[PDB]
Design an enzyme around this catalytic site. Sequence first.
Site, PDB file in Angstrom:
ATOM      1  N   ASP A   1     -10.674  -5.555  14.778  1.00  0.00           N
ATOM      2  CA  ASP A   1      -9.467  -4.766  15.111  1.00  0.00           C
ATOM      3  C   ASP A   1      -9.317  -3.583  14.148  1.00  0.00           C
ATOM      4  O   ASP A   1      -8.228  -3.246  13.685  1.00  0.00           O
ATOM      5  CB  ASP A   1      -8.221  -5.651  15.076  1.00  0.00           C
TER       6      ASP A   1
ATOM      7  N   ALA B   1       0.864  -1.200   0.000  1.00  0.00           N
ATOM      8  CA  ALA B   1       0.000   0.000   0.000  1.00  0.00           C
ATOM      9  C   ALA B   1       0.887   1.233   0.000  1.00  0.00           C
ATOM     10  O   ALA B   1       1.491   1.551   1.016  1.00  0.00           O
ATOM     11  CB  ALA B   1      -0.932   0.015   1.216  1.00  0.00           C
TER      12      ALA B   1
HETATM   13  N1  LIG Z   1       0.884  -3.899   2.871  1.00  0.00           N
HETATM   14  C1  LIG Z   1       1.466  -2.857   3.525  1.00  0.00           C
HETATM   15  N2  LIG Z   1       1.913  -1.733   2.897  1.00  0.00           N
HETATM   16  C2  LIG Z   1       2.476  -0.702   3.567  1.00  0.00           C
HETATM   17  N3  LIG Z   1       2.641  -0.700   4.907  1.00  0.00           N
HETATM   18  C3  LIG Z   1       2.221  -1.765   5.659  1.00  0.00           C
HETATM   19  C4  LIG Z   1       1.595  -2.913   4.988  1.00  0.00           C
HETATM   20  N4  LIG Z   1       1.281  -3.822   5.931  1.00  0.00           N
HETATM   21  C5  LIG Z   1       1.673  -3.295   7.121  1.00  0.00           C
HETATM   22  N5  LIG Z   1       2.226  -2.070   6.960  1.00  0.00           N
HETATM   23  C6  LIG Z   1       2.780  -1.230   8.052  1.00  0.00           C
HETATM   24  O1  LIG Z   1       3.252  -2.096   9.097  1.00  0.00           O
HETATM   25  C7  LIG Z   1       2.428  -1.990  10.268  1.00  0.00           C
HETATM   26  C8  LIG Z   1       2.161  -3.354  10.923  1.00  0.00           C
HETATM   27  O2  LIG Z   1       1.425  -4.242  10.050  1.00  0.00           O
HETATM   28  P1  LIG Z   1       0.294  -5.227  10.654  1.00  0.00           P
HETATM   29  O3  LIG Z   1       0.005  -6.187   9.523  1.00  0.00           O
HETATM   30  O4  LIG Z   1      -0.795  -4.307  11.136  1.00  0.00           O
HETATM   31  O5  LIG Z   1       1.108  -5.898  11.875  1.00  0.00           O
HETATM   32  P2  LIG Z   1       0.524  -6.335  13.331  1.00  0.00           P
HETATM   33  O6  LIG Z   1      -0.268  -7.590  13.054  1.00  0.00           O
HETATM   34  O7  LIG Z   1       1.764  -6.653  14.121  1.00  0.00           O
HETATM   35  O8  LIG Z   1      -0.313  -5.164  13.812  1.00  0.00           O
HETATM   36  C9  LIG Z   1       1.168  -1.291   9.791  1.00  0.00           C
HETATM   37  O9  LIG Z   1       0.543  -0.566  10.863  1.00  0.00           O
HETATM   38  C10 LIG Z   1       1.694  -0.391   8.680  1.00  0.00           C
HETATM   39  O10 LIG Z   1       2.368   0.756   9.243  1.00  0.00           O
END
Ligand SMILES: Nc1ncnc2c1ncn2[C@@H]1O[C@H](COP(=O)(O)OP(=O)(O)O)[C@@H](O)[C@H]1O
Length: 265
Positions: A130, A87
């Site tokens: 969530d 993203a």
């Molecule tokens: N597909 C993506 N593209 C860009 N940034 C991402 C993406 N996935 C996660 N992030 C960044 O990494 C952070 C943690 O990802 P997440 O999947 O929410 O991990 P957790 O399960 O530990 O909360 C997100 O809050 C965002 O800042």
Amino acid sequence: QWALEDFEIGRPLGKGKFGNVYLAREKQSKFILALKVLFKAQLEKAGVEHQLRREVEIQSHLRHPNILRLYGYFHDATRVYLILEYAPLGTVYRELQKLSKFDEQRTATYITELANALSYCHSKRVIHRDIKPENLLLGSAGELKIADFGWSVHAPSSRRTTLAGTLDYLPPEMIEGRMHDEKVDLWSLGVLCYEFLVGKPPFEANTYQETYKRISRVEFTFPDFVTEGARDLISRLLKHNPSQRPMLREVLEHPWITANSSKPS
Ligand SMILES: Nc1ncnc2c1ncn2[C@@H]1O[C@H](COP(=O)(O)OP(=O)(O)O)[C@@H](O)[C@H]1O
Ligand SMILES: O=C1NC(=O)[C@@H]2C[C@@H](c3ccccc3)CC[C@H]12
Ligand SMILES: [Mg+2]
Ligand SMILES: [Mg+2]
């Protein structure tokens, strides 16, 4: 199939409790993506293998423009890797830190996109549980995408695992460990609408114990600048009784949404 050797790793995109997420490019295709890295020792210590399986199973089968894609996964004796859609415009959280508050058109547009994605989810009886700014990402056209399905399930449901961090987006029935359904996501939608307009969530407090109190009692007030239409929508969503919260269709057709959103149902 896939292995770490297949990818060139680049800059850190973000950090979560378990997730450490990196920019990456697949070597043969040059396809750019996001690699979510989880440490097996930490997964095993916390006993959250079941959530990670859910995350992969649920999110890999969903197909909606306003939901982030998961392409696959692999693992290698110290780590597990989820392969995600990248993203490029980052998180709503970051955007909110930058601007402090969103105007009504920006807010109503995000709420429409969110309600479309949730409507699609609920039609398969999937609940996300969530929904919060750090898990809402932005595509190349600035469109909102729901991510992080680690807590998602099928309704109805109880809770089998400990609430780690912030209580701020959870409804009374969830924080009191009672049975819950789809309506949990509608409550969170109300919390987000408020936070987008105001700059902070409606039950925010200095300690866990008092945030718990404000949520269970539904104690929130509005600043003067929040308009009558926004207040009507937020009040409808933040009802203690789940069955009194509106359907997503009623959210998408609310007069304040239709007047201010720049995107359709
Ligand atoms: N597909 C993506 N593209 C860009 N940034 C991402 C993406 N996935 C996660 N992030 C960044 O990494 C952070 C943690 O990802 P997440 O999947 O929410 O991990 P957790 O399960 O530990 O909360 C997100 O809050 C965002 O800042
Ligand atoms: O050793 C493992 N701990 C986990 O939590 C993982 C569950 C497994 C898995 C299977 C499918 C999807 C997501 C994870 C892979 C093996 C590791
Ligand atoms: Mg997250
Ligand atoms: Mg997670």
